[PDB]
Amino acid sequence: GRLEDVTVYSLEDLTALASEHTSKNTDTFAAVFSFLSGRLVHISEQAALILNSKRGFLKSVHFVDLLAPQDVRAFYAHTAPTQLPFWNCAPAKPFFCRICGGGDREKRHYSPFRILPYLVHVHSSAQPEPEPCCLTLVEKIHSGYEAPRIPVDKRIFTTTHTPGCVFLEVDERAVPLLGYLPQDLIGTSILTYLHPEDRPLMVAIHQKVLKYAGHPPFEHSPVRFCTQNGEYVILDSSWSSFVNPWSRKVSFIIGRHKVRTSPLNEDVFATRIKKAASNDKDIAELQEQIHKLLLQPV
Amino acid sequence: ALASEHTSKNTDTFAAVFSFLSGRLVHISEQAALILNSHFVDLLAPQDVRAFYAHTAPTQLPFWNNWPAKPFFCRICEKRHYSPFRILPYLVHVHSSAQPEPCCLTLVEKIHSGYEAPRIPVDKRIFTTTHTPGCVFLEVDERAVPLLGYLPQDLIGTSILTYLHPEDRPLMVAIHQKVLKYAGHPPFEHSPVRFCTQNGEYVILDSSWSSFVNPWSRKVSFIIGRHKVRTSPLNEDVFATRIKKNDKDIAELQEQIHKLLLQPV
Numbered sequence: 001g002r003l004e005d006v007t008v009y010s011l012e013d014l015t016a017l018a019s020e021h022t023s024k025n026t027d028t029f030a031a032v033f034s035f036l037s038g039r040l041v042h043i044s045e046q047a048a049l050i051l052n053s054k055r056g057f058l059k060s061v062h063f064v065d066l067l068a069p070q071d072v073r074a075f076y077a078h079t080a081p082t083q084l085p086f087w088n089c090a091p092a093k094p095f096f097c098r099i100c101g102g103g104d105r106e107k108r109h110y111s112p113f114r115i116l117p118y119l120v121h122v123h124s125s126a127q128p129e130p131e132p133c134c135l136t137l138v139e140k141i142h143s144g145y146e147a148p149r150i151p152v153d154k155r156i157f158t159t160t161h162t163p164g165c166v167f168l169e170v171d172e173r174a175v176p177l178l179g180y181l182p183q184d185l186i187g188t189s190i191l192t193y194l195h196p197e198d199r200p201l202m203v204a205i206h207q208k209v210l211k212y213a214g215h216p217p218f219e220h221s222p223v224r225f226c227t228q229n230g231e232y233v234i235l236d237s238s239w240s241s242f243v244n245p246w247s248r249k250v251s252f253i254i255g256r257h258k259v260r261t262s263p264l265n266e267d268v269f270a271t272r273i274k275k276a277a278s279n280d281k282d283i284a285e286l287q288e289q290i291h292k293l294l295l296q297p298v
Numbered sequence: 299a300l301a302s303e304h305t306s307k308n309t310d311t312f313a314a315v316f317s318f319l320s321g322r323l324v325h326i327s328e329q330a331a332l333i334l335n336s337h338f339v340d341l342l343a344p345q346d347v348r349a350f351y352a353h354t355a356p357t358q359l360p361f362w363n364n365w366p367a368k369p370f371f372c373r374i375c376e377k378r379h380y381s382p383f384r385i386l387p388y389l390v391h392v393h394s395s396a397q398p399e400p401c402c403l404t405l406v407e408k409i410h411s412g413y414e415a416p417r418i419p420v421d422k423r424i425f426t427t428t429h430t431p432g433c434v435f436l437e438v439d440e441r442a443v444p445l446l447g448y449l450p451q452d453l454i455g456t457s458i459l460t461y462l463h464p465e466d467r468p469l470m471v472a473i474h475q476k477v478l479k480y481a482g483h484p485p486f487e488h489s490p491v492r493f494c495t496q497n498g499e500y501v502i503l504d505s506s507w508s509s510f511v512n513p514w515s516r517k518v519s520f521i522i523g524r525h526k527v528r529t530s531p532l533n534e535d536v537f538a539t540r541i542k543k544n545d546k547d548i549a550e551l552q553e554q555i556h557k558l559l560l561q562p563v
Contacts, residue, residue: 002544073355080348083455089549090432090556187358214482217513238514245485245508246524256514 027140053101068098084119144176179228179268195224231263310408318400346372359389447496447536
């Protein structure tokens with residue numbers, strides 16, 4: 001089908017490919033993996049240091065095997081060879097993953113990474129052509145409460161949720177603020193992360209969500225939100241909504257959250273065990289009643 | 299529930315239960331659209347395999363008829379043919395000689411062109427879309443599938459502009475001007491536009507538009523349209539082979555839309 005040129009690369013071209021990103025700092029690497037096999041065609045010399053891994057081991061892994069299993073689905077979704085910009089018009093959408101250095105399921109430490117993916121072709125000949133590849137610019141990220149430390153007036157993030165109180169969207173600013181990746185939140189319920197003493201508050205919030213539909217956004221009472229290291233952070237939030245213009249019902253609820261405290265353990269990404277068993281009791285109670293009150297048109 | 303059995307269906311619907319961490323389909327309903335075999339991720343079109351995995355990842359699946367399920371789509375077929383199918387994936391558990399599996403049960407519905415066999419009523423030829431300030435599709439409702447020929451995965455991430463008749467594209471500038479002007483008000487109509495269905499032929503779309511404005515950064519966040527096809531396309535099967543398959547001259551248009559859509563309101 002009448003196609004424009006590709007720009008094909010080869011193995012020695014890959015050494016320099018995004019040296020601008022790889023020189024940014026000591027947390028960045030570039031990986032190129034084949035859409036055919038899932039194997040690494042090129043990865044930066046510094047990636048063994050950054051993943052705490054070994055150069056040999058990595059030239060022979062499938063990239064996905066490095067990924068935390070929670071993240072494999074976002075990986076496949078965000079790297080589909082069909083959404084991908086080519087590599088230089090609007091182009092390049094960040095996702096997140098935890099990636100380990102592939103140790104031995106005991107010494108395996110996952111760090112969170114921010115990824116920019118691009119499409120690329122390389123070298124050899126199969127039955128037709130030169131190798132479709134993903135170019136991945138990777139960067140280790142840090143808890144917003146360490147080191148640098150996101151300034152206080154910048155500790156803001158945005159989320160949206162369904163009338164069923166299920167998260168639809170979370171902007172990337174949340175990640176170093178809460179220690180979760182977007183995929184951890186999407187499809188889960190906001191109520192789960194809330195302090196129990198604070199969940200009933202959502203009732204009045206969604207009542208205001210109706211009252212103020214078509215009106216500017218409102219504030220209410222702060223709520224404690226559980227970061228992934230387990231400690232709570234106080235959200236000071238503004239809320240509003242989008243009502244479907246045709247059936248005038250609330251389609252989603254939107255929050256801009258100012259994070260007003262810091263946890264004690266400054267590392268929101270610290271490894272934690274947490275029991276996820278029995279707890280959806282008062283949760284379905286609130287979800288059911290909030291949903292219910294939200295069918296009132298307009 | 300925890301067993302080894304059955305739910306049947308019928309008439310361009312059938313069930314494939316397949317082995318989870320495994321491969322081979324356990325069960326398959328006596329109904330077979332085109333020639334037997336005994337394999338299943340294998341029956342999918344190249345470009346659909348990514349969706350088939352996303353929507354059937356064991357964690358996303360709900361339990362069967364519990365005490366809830368959401369569609370995805372693929373083309374899941376000389377050599378080959380490929381039809382469109384609507385799917386509902388579930389997690390269930392099955393017995394074998396191998397001392398309970400993990401098991402995904404899927405209910406599969408062959409999809410017809412809204413125009414072919416049992417045509418969709420004219421009053422029901424409505425669907426909705428959303429796109430960014432940069433004219434890229436974010437959301438497409440299922441009801442677009444039988445009407446355009448494309449599965450949502452073909453359209454999400456691509457540009458509205460691409461699909462519009464070149465004759466019709468520059469209405470988009472004005473349609474976006476009105477979006478700013480009618481921001482905060484109920485939907486508006488503007489001149490219609492023609493949309494290139496998957497087979498090659500165009501249809502007229504009569505639409506209303508509105509938008510969602512970010513409440514803090516007072517700029518348009520996305521644009522929503524509800525559309526109604528006026529007129530059957532030249533070809534019946536909106537899914538049929540498709541003939542005239544390059545073109546640019548779009549990019550400038552989208553910078554213009556994107557630039558004008560920067561105005562806070």
